[PDB]
Ligand binder design. Structure first.
Ligand SMILES: NC(=O)c1cc2c(-c3ccc(C(=O)NCc4cccc(N)c4)s3)cccc2s1
Ligand SMILES: NC(=O)c1cc2c(-c3ccc(C(=O)NCc4cccc(N)c4)s3)cccc2s1
Ligand SMILES: NC(=O)c1cc2c(-c3ccc(C(=O)NCc4cccc(N)c4)s3)cccc2s1
Ligand SMILES: NC(=O)c1cc2c(-c3ccc(C(=O)NCc4cccc(N)c4)s3)cccc2s1
Lengths: 317, 326, 326, 321
């Protein structure tokens, strides 16, 4: 991976981004900017490249007009036993935007409104194509030079609907994944909810040190997981006893058995954060609170649908 | 299971007005036939196993209740029973909450006053005494199966669904509640009233600290955690267990099994590392009277949590212990 | 078999006996040189068979009441610890050195206390009734002599748990305790409960305000007549439940007033003639605020001194009474 | 009935200090926080009405845990001598009393009516989310807080699941009765929209919109506003023969019954004139009254299917401008 080098007898590499992603000009297209993702030659990462290629192709093929905010794969090739995915050029990820523009205290509610709509449109396309992303978070969301259009990236995470709790990013992990319940598109809707709170506050919604702490924090917001849901979980015994008490595990392990968790998480107070806002922004923050309340239902089946999300006051009013 | 409705009348006299517990459903009712006096009603699940378990509970509560007519030995009072739509219904004295709820509401997840624990320990040892006098093993003593009055001053041992005659010796190592399970049950040794003494030991630590004493993921881990306190189980004890081969090798080394890929570490000894006094005291800076009682709780736990049931403090010795007497 | 106490003598290699308090068992004042010469009271129990058992019961009741109230909010004497000295049980108490009998002398000058002080003492005694009931204990001998006060006389503590029983013991005969404070259900031999302690407190509250015994009956029969001079004839349903009903009432449930050479007057009724208000006020003339409280004391005594225990104000209704609350 | 006395304590915590059978009480177990205790009459019918009220309020309260959709909060319940007692948030008075004391029998400020309208539509949105018909919405069953800024829908003794179809045409309050209930047509959330329509007019004018002496007269008064009920709607009515002939003429029954058979009813009810009244109003408020009238026009369509939706009502110029 060296600057000045040429890939596929056309891509002149002039920059790093941060597997490896480089910025290059296509000599065969009047030196138009591309991004090239070079995937490691090792056994696991190659088969993950094969999958990411197939998922992008299927999502690109299912959105020809590019209205549903997934990363555009231009083409692929091989350079010295290494798979290379050529992509539309893009500035940076929302993790970088939160640093530089958010200054670690989050973005303007207008920006979150716009980002919310685009991410909801991304879920719609993922559902249509029977795809779970499973690793949605600011780091896997790219933006253009002007920072107004986001594309969801990194589908090396991705799976078909029909297909474990340590696989992706703990903070954005849905409770049904943690307890080992059968899961659908709701896990991506959950991860989006976590992301929206983080885009406005700059902070992790559920900063749990373990899957156990994750369930505790989700229940600090919504109270104890419903018995009907706990029971459908293959890993219920790791978190709940035979009486369906929660086992709060602190790490040598100390365990506290709880009959109930009192809801204590004040989502509105954490979103506002003593800002003293004008009336128009205050209303949009209250509407984000309501949207989050509807997204972060512990039972997937009770979560706001993608269409109800796109129609939500926060995005529409 | 029976989904009972507010205002429904049971046995032509019990006006159901509330719910208490969702294993079995306990409802709050008023006795139309007895001045609207508060009762609790346990509706037993209708299957063959659960109704047989219910009739066993009925028998054991009657023996304990008849052996303690003046109600001094802290077992739940069964008033009477009836049948409603093929469900056995146990009518009980009106108790509101269990010590699990007390530990949440008044413990705030970090335990109760050492003096409250002292009084509760005395009350539980009196229940152990009644159980032994009637040749009964409870086999599932834990905060969830201990009820209290509204003031939380008096506790009643409840749920005789897991109970047996001392001689039934039919407790297999996967019955009941792992965290309160005595080492003799886990290795498949012959066992007695000692298993109830062990479970009370585990309960007392939890009442003071708010935390499980032995939070083992498995029976194997439960043995490890007990031996982290007392050192390796005695050879004479291992040899008497029909399940020794699941936990120990032919040399009587312990097999520490970490789980679905098993890792095994074979151990000649377990170094006593578990420090009960440091765990009980915790961060707290206590007045001298409380600090003394904690030290005495620790000595009592040391005498309760002997891995060999034959070496374990008796009920009478427990009641005569400095924690209880002084 | 009393114990010959000596000033300067040392008990349990730590208690410097410096003064006497009461002896009729022996209470002494001492300093604890093992704990900064801090003041304690030591009750030394008579070494005979009756008082040995009585001292052990007292010991058990104090531990239970003390345990049920760890922050000392419900006004019972604090037992610090106990020990044996020449085979005499010794109870070590927080250093109170005055009872309400002495306060009625020194500060009441035999004509009773300020109504505002009675109101405070009433709330404090109702809190002691609450703790006794929560622990299912009957004191059975509540009166000024068995109520201790701190040096400033702001705080009272119920003491002497030697007459005390479990609610179920049903063993209190009609000659056992202090005749003036003895409830009618005890006298007629009816089944009794916490009601008896509520009755004694009512008798005490009157005496705290007037300095005078409410019912100075020479006998159990005189006690019932004086009670009925306030409330009228005991209800029939109550007379019939009395094992000793034939000692006080004829087959027609007329009252037999025994004047003692025994003289007997058979009465179909008793006219309420006791004027509680007039006796509380008692030709005094008080500022308005005090006058209002005395009327409220009167209304509370009316609700406490119901002859049927099942009609008497509860402890919770007493604490919510206008006398306590307003 | 149970004659409850001042100073009495219910469930060993509720000190009854006042009348409103609904009573005012302080909860001795919750720092003397105020509550209202409804003591349900002790017979067969009222016990089941009370139990239905308990059930409908649990569901409604649980569906709206942040209390945004303006139904009465049921805190808990208990039995006192076999009377079901419902413990509610401690609300001041009903809109009937507000119309007397603050309205002076001639209605409320159009600003108040606008606020109240939005609050009632939010109550309709929740009732519909929970598949519940109130079936008795009127000023007497709407409560207000001490400042009269917040209304709550109360009295769910009349209520039913949308599917029940058990509401006969002599149930509930005649003046607020929807035409579909009167002709015995299958009905839905539309009957509560109708009752709100009727309430809004009464809240602004102080007067009953349709003060009909009988069900027949209620239909006549409604058709005085909108003309004869559509033929397709009449035919679907189980009781159509009590009010219309085989020719679908309306039979106007006047009471010694006399009957006038009418081919049509000419719309004569001037809703704008009635709302305006004697008043000369600032352009400010004249516009809000014109918008209320338009809103009332869209609510009071005789055909339930042609009525404004709850979302259309909330997004209506009357509320949003
Ligand atoms: N993952 C993927 O599949 C893809 C990522 C990209 C990108 C990236 C933009 C920012 C990236 C990043 O790692 N920033 C974090 C960061 C952190 C600290 C410093 C700097 N310079 C950057 S990666 C651009 C175009 C196509 C793709 S496909
Ligand atoms: N098992 C038995 O045999 C019996 C239990 C009872 C009880 C109970 C008191 C609290 C209970 C409980 O499940 N609390 C835990 C809990 C957990 C979570 C929520 C809530 N509300 C309560 S069950 C009361 C009266 C008689 C019996 S007999
Ligand atoms: N009864 C008991 O169990 C206890 C009594 C006490 C006391 C007493 C305070 C004054 C007493 C007394 O007899 N005063 C009356 C009196 C009468 C005549 C003269 C003098 N000096 C005093 S006894 C103090 C501390 C602990 C206990 S335990
Ligand atoms: N029905 C129900 O379910 C409920 C009614 C209420 C109320 C009431 C407020 C005023 C009422 C009333 O009858 N007003 C008429 C009026 C007018 C003039 C004088 C007096 N005393 C009364 S009833 C308050 C709190 C909870 C509930 S639940």
């Amino acid at each position: 991976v060296n600057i000045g080098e040429v890939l596929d007898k056309r891509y002149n590499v002039y920059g790093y981004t941060g597997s490896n992603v480089v910025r290059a000009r296509d000599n065969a297209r009047a030196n138009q900017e591309v991004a090239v993702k070079i995937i490691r030659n090792n056994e696991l990462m190659q088969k993950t490249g094969l999958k990411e290629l197939e998922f992008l192709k299927k999502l690109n093929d299912a959105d020809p007009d590019d209205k549903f905010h997934c990363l555009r794969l231009l083409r692929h090739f091989y350079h010295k036993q290494h798979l290379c995915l050529v992509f539309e050029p893009l500035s940076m990820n929302l993790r970088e935007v939160l640093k530089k523009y958010g200054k670690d205290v989050g973005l303007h509610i207008k920006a979150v409104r716009s980002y919310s709509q685009q991410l909801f449109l991304a879920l719609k396309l993922l559902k249509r194509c029977n795809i779970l992303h499973a690793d949605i978070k600011p780091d896997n969301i790219l933006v253009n030079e002007s920072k107004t259009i986001l594309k969801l990236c990194d589908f090396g995470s991705a799976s078909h609907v029909a297909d474990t709790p340590y696989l992706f990013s703990r903070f954005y992990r849905a409770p049904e994944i943690i307890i080992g319940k059968s899961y659908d598109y709701g896990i991506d809707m959950w991860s989006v909810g976590c992301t929206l709170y983080e885009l406005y506050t700059g902070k992790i919604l559920f900063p749990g040190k373990t899957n156990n702490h994750m369930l505790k924090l989700a229940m600090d917001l919504k109270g104890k997981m419903p018995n009907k849901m706990i029971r459908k979980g293959v890993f219920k015994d790791q978190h709940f006893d035979q009486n369906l008490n929660f086992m709060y595990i602190e790490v040598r392990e100390k365990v506290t058995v709880m009959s109930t968790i009192n809801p204590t998480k004040d989502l509105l107070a954490d979103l506002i954060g003593c800002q003293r806002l004008p009336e128009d922004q205050r209303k949009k923050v209250h509407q984000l609170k309501d949207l989050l309340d509807q997204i972060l239902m512990l039972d997937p089946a009770k979560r706001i649908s993608i269409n109800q999300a796109l129609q939500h006051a926060f995005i529409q009013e």
